Amino acid sequence: CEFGYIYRLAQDYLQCVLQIPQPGSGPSKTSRVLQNVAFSVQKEVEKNLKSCLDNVNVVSVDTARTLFNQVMEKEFEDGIINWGRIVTIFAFEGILIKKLLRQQIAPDVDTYKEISYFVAEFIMNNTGEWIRQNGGWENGFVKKFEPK
Numbered sequence: 001c002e003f004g005y006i007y008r009l010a011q012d013y014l015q016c017v018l019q020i021p022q023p024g025s026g027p028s029k030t031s032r033v034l035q036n037v038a039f040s041v042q043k044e045v046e047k048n049l050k051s052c053l054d055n056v057n058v059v060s061v062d063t064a065r066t067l068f069n070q071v072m073e074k075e076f077e078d079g080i081i082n083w084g085r086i087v088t089i090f091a092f093e094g095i096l097i098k099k100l101l102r103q104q105i106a107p108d109v110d111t112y113k114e115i116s117y118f119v120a121e122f123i124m125n126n127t128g129e130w131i132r133q134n135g136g137w138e139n140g141f142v143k144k145f146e147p148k
């Protein structure tokens with residue numbers, strides 16, 4: 001269930017940014033902690049990198065996937081993995097969602113689940129083993145970022 005858990009975190013973050021809460025039992029405790037930390041990092045990246053983010057047009061899910069993979073390959077190229085870098089992946093997906101909502105040439109809600117897929121694929125394939133060895137999401141991420 002490793003991929004599915006990360007896909008659900010990425011989808012919950014996307015629904016948070018788009019302000020489209022899905023009814024039912026709601027997000028898990030990991031998801032709730034992740035949403036505040038990643039949103040804080042997202043607003044900081046948006047502010048600092050506004051000029052260069054504004055020069056790019058996210059016109060399709062293919063462009064979002066390509067930009068996500070190029071930016072995240074560079075973010076992790078030195079071989080270091082830490083929780084802050086993992087929170088930045090979610091923050092970056094939130095930026096791409098916002099730009100896609102503004103500039104997607106043929107708007108399609110069913111294409112938003114493609115973003116949660118390519119975020120989960122990157123996390124699983126590049127950081128999954130480190131995540132497990134550092135406590136997973138409940139004994140690693142939550143313990144580190146939950147309120148004291």
Ligand SMILES: *CCC(=O)N(c1ccc(O[C@@H]2CC[C@@H](N)C2)cc1)[C@@H](CC(C)(C)O)c1ccc(Cl)cc1
Pocket residue numbers: 045049052053054056058067070071075088092096099
């Ligand atoms: C001003 C930087 C820039 O041109 N790009 C960019 C690089 C990295 C980045 O975010 C990561 C995560 C937070 C930071 N630690 C760095 C955001 C923007 C562009 C990269 C290109 C030129 C494509 O390689 C860029 C611009 C706009 C978008 Cl939507 C994506 C990437």
